Design a protein around this ligand. Sequence first.
Ligand SMILES: [Fe+3]
Ligand SMILES: [Fe+3]
Length: 281
Amino acid sequence: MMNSIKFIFLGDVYGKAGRNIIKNNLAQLKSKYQADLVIVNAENTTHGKGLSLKHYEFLKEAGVNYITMGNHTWFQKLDLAVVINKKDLVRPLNLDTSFAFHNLGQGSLVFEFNKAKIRITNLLGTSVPLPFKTTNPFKVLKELILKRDCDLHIVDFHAETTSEKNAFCMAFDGYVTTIFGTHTHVPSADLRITPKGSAYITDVGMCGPGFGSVIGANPEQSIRLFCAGSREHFEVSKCGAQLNGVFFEVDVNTKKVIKTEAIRIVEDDPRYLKQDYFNLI
Ligand SMILES: [Fe+3]
Ligand SMILES: [Fe+3]
């Protein structure tokens, strides 16, 4: 018989484009994989940064069960007290006490699902430039692990560097169920069940604007930044869309990952064809 739990983890939700492609495909995907639970990083949901209450309910009504965040966790000030306090939402645990919000919400949570105590933890890589101070991710997660209270442990490591990501993978490989990297907005072809029985991927990717955008932003301001050096406001792209995620199923008994598959959907937009960014635009 052997009962397992089938999950679906989606990368950084970015703007209206990300919101829409998830609403239009989650049911189908949930059905295709017979998924039991859906987890998503929603750090870029509202206007490319943070999550409004309105958008939190949207994701919730779209089928999302749990949410992890990142460096833009606290941008939507108006509803943060209410949003990040949501019981099924986890923010970076890795926060230094000098930072306001160091105690606003959960950095890790536990719930049980069919004879299984499941833990979801979110952390910030030391390689990510932040306006505030953070504690060491490696040390923090190690201490949490030594607390030994969970059969499954899902980790969303929001980091910038491939070296920090893989060093993290090497450090906690068998001590956790999954180590999924996020933050670069580009999926890696890294996905696999590790030699120790965990699931790993350098970066899940993003759920937001598609080809014709720069990591979710309008190309114009981006090209200018890298050319002239102008600091002109970033703008959310409305060009097409992409959905990136990971499907994985554990085994409640051995609590080892038994299967993994990368999930990807790309929608091109004809409006990109009319663009001529070459005129360093
Ligand atoms: Fe992001
Ligand atoms: Fe980020």
